[PDB]
Design a binder for this molecule. Structure first.
Ligand SMILES: *[C@@](C)(CO)[C@](*)(O)[C@H](CC(C)C)NC(=O)[C@H](Cc1ccccc1)NC(=O)[C@H](CC(C)C)NC(=O)[C@H](CCc1ccccc1)NC(=O)CN1CCOCC1
Lengths: 240, 233, 231, 244, 195, 222, 212, 235
């Protein structure tokens, strides 16, 4: 078997392969997560250099891991499929042995553990992917939003963004998001998410994807027209 | 799982004041057929140990090779191989006892009963038994097979407990062994008249006696025995 | 230079640089001394600390009731090798009912260290060991080096500034060899020997480490207030 | 040891790119152009053979277009030998699904699994990636007619019309211009050939330098038919559209 | 584990499964649900060796649920039954086979038709209008041969099912403590609480 | 067909006092109707004030004792010469025995010593590792003869206070080392009389805070 | 063995005997057949002594590792299923185990799970396990109501074991009582059958078959 | 390139020495041992204000009598903690007793050098392992990726380690109370931390014989921070 230690330390105390995997994430399309009072919303950028696409069949950016948890990402698309598959299997395996679906923290911890294992295993390179994992624990109404990254570290966020120009949209969220009073309704949370993506995206046509997750396995993806209504409303209020 | 084919019968032994005696006949039986008559079942290891083996002869020959190889291995990188770091009876025994139990534990035993007789470096007598099951025990007298049933009773009349060992000379002890070998020739259907005897003494060392024969037998009274009850002729 | 990338490469003059670099790790290690008479064998070790708040790194390891060693260099490598010695001593007891000879103990360590110097991927051990013991041929003292070379000696010392203690023992050879049936005097000679390798620092109560084995003495280690006698 | 000679095929650049994947894509960009166009009532696959020789046996040849099962086909761009390794795997995977579920494999599932194999060669194993880009054209009863593409990175995406291989930049612009959603197969056939005719590096587009295929519902009542075009059939369709 | 029945009617599939769990000379439980929901429109009842039954049912359930998440799509009853058969077909030539017999009742949303599949532990699959495993069949098959009609309603199917349970309660040696009945149709799976 | 097990006979006995504990066992070793040895010890000092005996099939008994003795050795190496407590030793032995659940050691094991409060302790094990601390336990061939006698004399079972109409039980109390050795010797002489596999000699190991003492007594050799 | 545990208004009662046998030989009268897994979980054991003890002792380690990893006490369902999945792996190898995992959690409430060595796992309100289970069932079922008081429930559990201890030759020694509430398990003492039988006979007026 | 398990000319393993540099970049962690208990405290260091700081788990339970604080590439610690927890529980299963803090530390440190060409690189994280046992009492260990561990009366690791260690040198004495030790960790953390110390960006914990290992609440730590400020202003 191929044994080579690809991820190793450098004189200055860095693991370059892990850090170069972050650069791949930085290249990826932007993804944003915002959690409200009774919901979480996952926004995702889709680059508009690709026309003549078939949006019916093209892999969606947001993936369901179980009926109550979702996972979006930024970075290498092919790499993300491997993590999603592993997470989906672990989700079913957990239901089988514990007789209870995974918590959002547990699922995140698992995915993060897989990412870490690839940073000190021989013959493999790190995943060029950072994820945003969101959902609601079983029989719980408190919204959950977590982030992972190639190194394997993970943490919880009131709101967070990853991918290209994420430092711009993070700057937007940092002043617009209030900890003491988060988005009270679904509309308020979605609007803030769309607003934040409009700082970076370009046009609010078929570039923005929105997915809303609510308690008790209530997940739904918004259509073009539904998203476009938020874009139209925000731009009219902007001109002031 | 085995079955023994070519087999060796009783091995008998005892302690005396200065050392140990061990004996075994020179027969290799093939069931009821007394097939081989030149078989040596006492195997010396160095000049201070004799391993007496009963049971399957193919497995005995394997054990011979192991002991032969053990001497070779001990000599490697060992300047004191013929002195302080020479092979002791206790070392040789424990090795065999380890093998016997490992083989029974893999359900593929060496089909034997073994008696390791010798004298230690400090002058102490060594005499211990081990068999196909890995079972081990020591006693002033030890015997295998029919020996256990017929020899031990006779040898225990000489050395019944530990305190009788210093009181027993090599002359008395050898006489009891040779007597026991005669009784076994009378009564064991898979025994032979010819046998080998080994004495390991702390003073005079190893004395290995070959081509001995059972003698001074009582058969004359047979002529007077007629029929099985009534018959007078 | 170009021939020190791994252990599998010889230099043009016939040297193994990775083995020599492993040897260098021993010289950085704290000093330890070994010496014997005809009845007893003694290990004296100067323990090292990270700072005043830290403990003092333990240098002496027990292998059996009749054998043990002191280390100098990479401590984890000494743990691997001492563990191997424990198993080999233990194998000799269970299988042959026989206490392992100190000479065979050295031969086994040599052969284990050697395999690491001839194969790709692995590395040499980065530690030197002083093995003492009492077997059927009396008291013994061995010096192990991770090149594989094992040497039986009357006395020796390895580590930083070990040349001072090694010169002392070379002068004292005729005196300490005849310290028979006297443990405390043989230790004193060892404590005086290691003192020739000291600079600025002196031997304190939680700094000094002593071990002894002999005729009617199992391998025992002395630390703390138990070594206050010899200061 | 052997470390000295290791190219390290599965590592990141400082910029966060996979060297070998990028260089494999550079290889594919010199391969003969392949075009896929999806219509409302069928799919078209068109591909240009790599600089044909006059003594090449054209009728009993297969370089670009391969059949995976009765409902799914692929157009190849890159190393043919590499493609055939992947094609046989894809053919086997389709039969495993049919054996297990007694149903023909959904197009995306086949595409995903094949793309997952390519991904594996970029993350572990220390081997070079497959220098191949596919255009998958197929049908199932869930999504109907579908076009996909995969590349050495193991990333796949869906398309209404797409090109791979050489001159994709020029080819994609022309497709984007003339394509529309209510298009028919016969119109899509014409678009595919016109696009190759303009993007080709050759002097003039001829029958002997082309492979062509369609996936219609043109069979009798609610069933799909795969048509791998013969040399004479390509000759006729080339005259019918007014290219020769 | 003993009695499991199945009846496919016009617009639904009805599964009846006994509630008794017996070991030795003791009925340990009389409210046992011998079924698992594989998907929203597919239900599998099971009966056989202790331990094996639930272990197998849940393993299948896990696999089908994994498929549903991966593809965001519900497998057809025909596809599920074929997957289950293959698992049992592998099992029979294993070191220790699953000794489990199953009925798979499902509603195909694409065809708008109910479907009942009977699979034994050997991996022997058959699509049927009515099915049973174990000794139950020796009474119920002949009874259904007589009374069953293909165009029956769900209510008519439940009366037909009551007729089977009555006969079993009359002639079966063991007390199986009644049945849990479940209906599978276009609207999914639901349980009849009063039977 | 090859049978890997055998019966080497013999019988063992453990009794716990207030500040001491004894582990006794006859010295006879047998196979079928033959005596193999009149003095073959099977009660062993294993270190850390723990005495042990594994009666039954001697080869498995010796193997187990040998392995536990080795377990004690490695416990010292791995945990800074810490003393192995009797309760810890018992649990360790369970894992040794159950480790061969599907090819068991055919032995009844008993260990004795002092608990961490300094009080006498006796533990007993079945062949596959189930264990229990008790004041009293006999094991081996003549266990069925000795054990009920111990219930009566050590734990005062079925004994009531005279004149109390069988209403007040005889109060439990610890026995002296002198009284315990009397019960051991009487148990073994009684067992020797009525069991053929028991006799030759009796070896008792007594465990106090001071250490491990031995005592030997002759038994009938028939 | 005889062991039982039933669910009621005031939580869970758990009761077991203490005998251990090797054939007809009474090996012990003081065996502990309730394993204390944690302050909120109990496990009953019946069948092969070593199998039960070894694997439920092992179960406690797995439950401990759960709460270290998940920062939360393991559910009764998850605990029972760890054990049932374990014994299922050994199915056919000859393990003999009849166990009941009893405990309380917030999400579940009081819960009892029957688990045995041939892989059966059942949730339920009443279970009796062991060689004398039928004798316990007879007394327990005929006197059981959901609205029993804590005092009456404790006695019924004790009395059911006593009934089995009397009739079943392979059950006896003493009765160990436990009560499981929302606050955790509470031990309710060891009751020697030697004294308990006569005490129950006199006070209750039952056991008229026996010579008084 | 070059081998993973290569020695430098000075006699050190390159990869082990480079992993130590990674640990210096990590957030500060401090441990102080007393006769009344051992205290562990860490700098959380949230990379952004939107990050929910309570999800930063840099103090961790191994058993009821052993706790752990980390510094460096904290993702690498997960498998080290997993091993420690298994080692602790497994020993309790085999020997029916709590496991010695030193023996636990040794078990963790055995993983350290199990790398080469086993895992591909050393761990990029240092651990402070604090605990209590009957034999050696309250203990604090510093476990490195070199496979070496030192016992400490007090120890600081991370970015402000050398500055904090010098401060601990002066402040530590053998008669420290638990309350005094708690305040001393907070005091030294506030000195070396970049951002201003409060209950949200710093965390305290302890291990006592009676109550075992406990991570303090944000309400409890807040009062200790307020008590600390008042005592410094009082002279
Ligand atoms: C009631 C009391 C009886 O069924 C309970 O079910 C109890 C459960 C309690 C103890 C947890 N069950 C037993 O007491 C159980 C019955 C049993 C026996 C054998 C197999 C399954 C169940 N008894 C035992 O487990 C005893 C306990 C000892 C005596 C403390 N153990 C044995 O019988 C052992 C081990 C049996 C065994 C099982 C699996 C593999 C190998 C062996 N056997 C012996 O001690 C043999 N022995 C040799 C000569 O002396 C007589 C006994």
């Amino acid at each position: 078997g191929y044994d080579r230690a690809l991820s190793i330390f450098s004189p200055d105390g860095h693991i370059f392969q892990v850090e170069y995997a972050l650069e791949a994430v930085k290249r990826g399309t932007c993804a944003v997560g915002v959690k409200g009072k009774n919901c979480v919303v996952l926004g995702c950028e889709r680059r508009s250099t690709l026309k003549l696409q078939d949006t019916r069949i093209t892999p969606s950016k947001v993936s369901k891991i179980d009926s109550h948890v979702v996972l979006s990402f930024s970075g290498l698309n092919a790499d993300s499929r491997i993590l999603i598959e592993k997470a989906r299997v672990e989700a079913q395996s957990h239901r089988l042995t514990l007789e209870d679906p995974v918590t959002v923290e547990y699922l995140t911890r698992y995915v993060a553990g897989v990412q870490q294992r690839y940073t000190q295993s021989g013959g493999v390179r790190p995943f060029g992917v950072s994820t945003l994992i969101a959902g609601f624990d079983p029989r719980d109404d408190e919204p959950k939003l977590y982030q992972t990254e190639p190194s394997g570290i993970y943490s919880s966020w009131s709101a967070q963004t990853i991918g290209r120009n994420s430092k711009t949209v993070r700057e937007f969220l940092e002043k617009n998001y209030d900890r003491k009073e988060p988005p009270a309704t679904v509309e308020e949370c979605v609007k803030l998410t769309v607003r934040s993506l409009l700082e970076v995206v370009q046009t609010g046509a078929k570039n923005i994807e929105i997915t809303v997750v609510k308690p008790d396995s209530d997940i739904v993806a918004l259509s073009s027209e539904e998203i476009n209504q938020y874009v139209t409303q925000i731009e009219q209020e902007k001109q002031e | 799982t085995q079955q023994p084919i070519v087999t060796g019968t009783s091995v008998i032994s005892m302690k005396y004041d200065n050392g140990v005696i061990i004996a075994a006949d020179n027969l290799g039986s093939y069931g009821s057929l007394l097939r081989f008559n030149g078989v040596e079942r006492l195997i010396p290891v160095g000049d201070n140990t004799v391993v007496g083996i009963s049971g399957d002869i193919s497995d005995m020959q394997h054990i011979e090779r192991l002991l032969k190889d053990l001497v070779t291995e001990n000599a490697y990188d060992n300047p004191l191989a013929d002195a302080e770091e020479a092979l002791e009876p206790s070392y040789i025994f424990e090795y065999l006892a380890t093998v016997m139990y490992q083989r029974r534990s893999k359900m593929n035993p060496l089909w034997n009963a073994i008696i390791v007789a010798g004298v230690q470096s400090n002058g102490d007598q060594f005499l211990r038994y081990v068999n196909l099951l890995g079972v081990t025990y020591s006693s002033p007298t030890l015997a295998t097979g029919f020996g256990a049933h017929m020899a031990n009773p006779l040898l225990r009349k000489v050395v019944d407990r530990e305190s009788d060992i210093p009181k027993t000379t090599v002359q008395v002890a050898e006489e009891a062994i040779v007597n026991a070998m005669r009784v076994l020739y009378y009564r064991d259907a898979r025994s032979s008249r010819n046998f080998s005897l080994a004495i390991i003494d702390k003073n005079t060392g190893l004395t290995f006696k070959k081509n001995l024969q059972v003698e001074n037998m009582k058969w004359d009274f047979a002529k007077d025995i007629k029929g099985y009850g009534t018959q007078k002729i | 230079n170009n021939y020190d990338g791994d252990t599998v490469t010889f230099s043009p003059t016939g040297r193994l640089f990775q083995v020599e670099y492993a040897l260098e790790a021993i010289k950085q290690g704290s000093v330890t001394v070994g010496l014997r008479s005809n009845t007893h064998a003694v290990l004296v070790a100067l323990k090292r600390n990270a700072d005043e708040l830290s403990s003092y790194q333990k240098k002496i390891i027990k292998c059996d009731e009749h054998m043990g060693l002191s280390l100098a260099g990479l401590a984890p490598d000494a743990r691997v090798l001492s563990n191997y010695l424990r198993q080999q001593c233990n194998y000799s007891s269970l299988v042959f009912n026989r206490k392992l000879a100190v000479e065979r103990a050295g031969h086994l360590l040599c052969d284990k260290a050697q395999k690491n110097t001839q194969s790709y991927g692995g590395r040499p051990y980065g530690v030197g060991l002083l093995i003492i013991g009492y077997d059927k041929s009396g008291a013994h003292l061995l010096e192990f080096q991770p090149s594989g070379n094992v040497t039986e000696l009357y006395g020796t010392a390895i580590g930083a500034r070990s040349q001072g203690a090694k010169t002392y023992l070379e002068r004292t050879l005729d005196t300490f060899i005849k310290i028979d049936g006297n443990p405390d005097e043989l230790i004193k000679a060892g404590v005086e020997a290691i003192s020739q390798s000291l600079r600025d620092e002196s031997l304190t109560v939680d700094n000094l480490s002593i071990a002894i084995v002999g005729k009617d003495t199992p391998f025992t280690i002395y630390d703390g207030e138990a070594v206050a006698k010899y200061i | 040891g052997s470390r000295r000679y290791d190219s390290r095929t599965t590592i990141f650049s400082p910029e966060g790119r996979l060297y070998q994947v990028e260089y494999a894509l550079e290889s594919i960009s010199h391969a003969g152009t392949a075009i896929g166009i999806m219509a409302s009532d069928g799919i078209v696959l068109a591909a240009e053979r790599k600089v044909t020789s006059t003594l090449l046996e054209q009728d009993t040849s297969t370089e670009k277009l391969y059949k995976l099962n009765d409902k799914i086909a692929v157009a190849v761009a890159g190393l043919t030998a590499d493609a055939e390794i992947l094609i046989n795997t894809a053919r086997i995977h389709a039969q495993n699904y049919l054996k297990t579920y007694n149903e023909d494999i959904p197009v995306e599932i086949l595409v995903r699994r094949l793309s997952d194999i390519k991904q594996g060669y970029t993350q572990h194993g220390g081997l070079r990636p497959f220098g191949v880009s596919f255009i998958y054209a197929g049908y199932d009863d869930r999504y109907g007619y579908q076009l996909y593409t995969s590349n050495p990175s193991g990333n796949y995406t869906g398309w209404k019309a797409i090109s791979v291989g050489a001159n994709t930049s020029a080819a994609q612009t022309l497709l984007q211009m003339d394509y529309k959603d209510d298009m028919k197969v016969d119109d899509a056939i014409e678009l595919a050939l016109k696009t190759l005719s303009k993007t080709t590096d050759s002097s003039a587009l001829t029958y002997d330098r082309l492979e062509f295929a369609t996936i219609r519902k043109g069979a009798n009542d609610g069933e799909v038919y795969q048509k791998i075009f013969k040399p004479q059939e390509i000759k006729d369709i080339l005259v019918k559209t007014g290219i020769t | 584990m003993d009695i499991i029945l199945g009846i496919r009617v016009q617009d639904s599939v009805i599964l009846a499964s006994s509630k008794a769990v017996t070991r030795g000379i003791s009925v340990l439980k009389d409210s046992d649900d011998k079924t698992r929901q594989l998907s929203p429109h597919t239900l599998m009842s099971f009966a056989g060796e202790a331990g094996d039954t639930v272990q197998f049912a849940e393993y299948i359930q896990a696999n089908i649920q994994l498929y549903s998440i991966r593809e965001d799509y519900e497998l057809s009853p025909q596809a599920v039954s074929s997957f289950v058969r293959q698992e049992l077909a592998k099992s029979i030539r294993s070191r220790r086979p699953y000794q489990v017999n199953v009925l798979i009742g499902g509603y195909d949303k694409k065809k708008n038709k109910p479907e009942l599949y009977q699979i034994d532990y050997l991996g022997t699959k058959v699509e049927l209008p009515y099915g049973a495993h174990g000794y139950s069949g020796f009474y119920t098959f002949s009874l259904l041969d007589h009374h069953y009609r293909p165009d029956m309603t769900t209510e008519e199917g439940l009366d037909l099912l009551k007729l089977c349970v009555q006969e079993l309660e009359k002639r079966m040696p063991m007390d199986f403590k009644g049945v849990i009945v479940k209906i599978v149709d276009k609207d999914g799976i639901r349980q009849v609480d009063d039977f | 067909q090859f049978n890997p097990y055998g019966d080497n006979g013999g019988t063992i006995l453990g009794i716990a006092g207030e500040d001491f504990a004894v582990l006794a066992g006859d010295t006879r070793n047998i196979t079928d109707y033959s005596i193999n040895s009149r003095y073959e010890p099977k009660v062993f000092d294993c270190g850390d004030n723990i005495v042990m005996s594994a009666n039954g099939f001697a080869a498995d008994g010796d193997a187990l004792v040998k392995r536990f003795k080795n377990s004690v050795k490695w416990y010292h190496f791995d945990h800074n010469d810490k003393k192995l407590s009797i309760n810890s030793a018992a649990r360790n032995i369970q894992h040794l025995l159950y480790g061969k659940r599907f090819f068991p050691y055919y032995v009844h094991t008993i260990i004795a010593g002092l608990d961490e409060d300094g009080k006498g302790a006796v533990y007993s094990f079945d062949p596959v590792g189930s264990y229990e601390r008790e004041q009293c336990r006999a094991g081996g061939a003549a266990a069925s003869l000795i054990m009920p006698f111990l219930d009566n004399q050590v734990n005062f079972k079925n004994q009531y206070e005279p004149g109390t109409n069988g209403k007040v039980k005889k109060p439990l109390k610890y026995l002296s080392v002198e009284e315990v050795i009397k019960l051991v010797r009487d148990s073994f002489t009684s067992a020797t009389e009525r069991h053929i596999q028991v006799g030759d000699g009796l070896e008792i190991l007594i465990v106090t805070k001071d250490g491990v003492r031995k005592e030997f007594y002759e038994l009938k050799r028939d | 063995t005889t062991t039982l545990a039933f669910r009621f208004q005031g939580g869970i009662i758990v009761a077991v005997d203490s005998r251990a046998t090797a054939g007809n030989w009474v090996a012990s009268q003081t065996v502990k057949k309730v394993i204390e897994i944690n302050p909120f979980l109990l496990g009953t054991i019946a069948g092969g002594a070593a199998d039960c003890q070894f694997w439920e002792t092992w179960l406690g380690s797995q439950c401990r590792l759960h709460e270290l990893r998940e920062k939360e006490r393991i559910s009764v369902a998850a605990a029972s299923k760890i054990l049932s999945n374990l014994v299922y792996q050994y199915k056919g190898a000859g393990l003999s185990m009849g166990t009941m995992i009893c405990g309380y959690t917030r999400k579940e409430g009081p819960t009892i799970y029957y688990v045995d060595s041939d892989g059966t796992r059942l949730k339920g309100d009443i279970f009796c396990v062991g060689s004398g289970q039928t004798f316990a069932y007879g007394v327990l079922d005929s006197n059981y109501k959901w609205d029993l008081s804590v005092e009456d429930a404790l006695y019924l559990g004790k009395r059911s074991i006593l009934a089995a201890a009397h009739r079943d030759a392979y059950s006896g020694g003493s009765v160990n009582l436990y009560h499981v509430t929302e606050d955790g398990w509470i031990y309710h003492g060891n009751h020697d059958v030697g004294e308990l039988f006569w005490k129950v006979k006199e006070e209750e007026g039952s056991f008229n078959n026996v010579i008084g | 390139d070059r081998g993973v398990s290569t020695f430098s000319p000075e006699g050190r393993l390159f990869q082990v020495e480079y992993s130590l540099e990674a640990i210096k970049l990590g957030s500060t962690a401090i441990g102080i041992a007393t006769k009344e208990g051992v205290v562990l405290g860490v700098e959380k260091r949230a990379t952004s204000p939107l990050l929910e700081s309570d999800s930063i788990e840099k103090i961790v339970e191994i058993d009821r009598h052993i706790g752990c604080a980390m510094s460096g590439l904290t993702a690498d610690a997960r498998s080290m903690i997993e091993h420690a927890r298994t080692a602790a529980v497994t020993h309790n299963l085999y020997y029916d007793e709590d496991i010695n803090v030193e023996s636990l530390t040794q078990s963790v440190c055995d993983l350290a050098l199990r790398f080469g060409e086993l895992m591909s690189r050393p761990f990029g994280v240092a651990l402070l392992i604090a605990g209590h046992d009957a034999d050696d009492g309250y203990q604090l260990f510093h476990a490195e990726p070199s496979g070496t561990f030192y016992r400490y009366n007090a120890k600081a690791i991370g970015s402000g380690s050398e500055g904090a260690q010098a401060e601990l040198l002066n402040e530590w004495h053998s008669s420290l109370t638990l309350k005094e030790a708690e305040l001393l960790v907070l005091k030294i953390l506030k000195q070396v931390m970049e951002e201003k110390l409060d209950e949200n960006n710093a965390q305290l914990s302890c291990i006592t014989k009676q109550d075992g290992f406990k991570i303090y609440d944000n309400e409890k730590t807040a009062e200790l921070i307020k008590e600390l400020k008042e005592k410094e202003a009082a002279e």
